[model samples]
Target: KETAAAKFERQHMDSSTSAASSSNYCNQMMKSRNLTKDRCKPVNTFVHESLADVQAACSQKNVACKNGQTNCYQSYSTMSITDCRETGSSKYPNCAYKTTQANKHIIVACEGNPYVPVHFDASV
Candidate 1:
């Protein structure tokens, strides 16, 4: 004789398993476009100097910027740097130029239930 609670538990378990399988399939599909990891991975981002400044400006608005080690989202937000450095773009010999003469760097940890940017840091 099984109680109603036991029966409900069994049904819930089966549903969960099915949902997991579906989720796995979705994960595989997502991987085709971007990276997916159980934990956040360390990544280096190089941003245009102007963009870097934008991030800095955002920090002024009470946005927290963590230095050195900033947490970031696995798939969305990332750390970036800005300077007049060439990245070997044939179209522009001096690539990343027309940007900031000053080299600005920042680290940010982006996380959340839906993965929105949060923490950030600026480096000289």
Candidate 2:
């Protein structure tokens, strides 16, 4: 079974890709990363940073979660990330996405005894 931390890494982390130059980046990545299954994810982000750096966000300033949970934290430093947004005409199994890369402060939800990021709330 995949742990929360592992799932977070699988879905969001992409240290190897510093930038996404191709417009097809999201289209390829969303499927290749297994985010496109029965339905295409409406919005997703890929952090272009080391795992350790992303994990360190759990220690940053506390913030309200998007779902109104109290376990969220916002990163102090801006991070390089690629935002994947599903296009209006996109259909399941043929998921099309618009890839937008930007440096922004990220917000994430943390959990567990050690307190690590489990969900990506948003980026600003």
What lDDT does model 1 reach? 0.30
lDDT per residue for candidate 2 within 34-123, as digits (tens), equals: 999888989999999998899999999899997889999999999999999998989988899999999999999999977888999999
| TM-score, structure 2 vs. true | 0.94
At residue 18, candidate 2 shows an lDDT of 87
Give the Å shift of residue 73 in candidate 1.
7.8
RMSDs, each prediction?
19.7, 1.1
lDDT of each: 0.30, 0.92
- Cα-lDDT of candidate 2: 0.92
> TM-score, each model?
0.20, 0.94
- Backbone clashes for every candidate come to 8, 0
Model 2 misplaced stretches (Cα beyond 4 Å): none
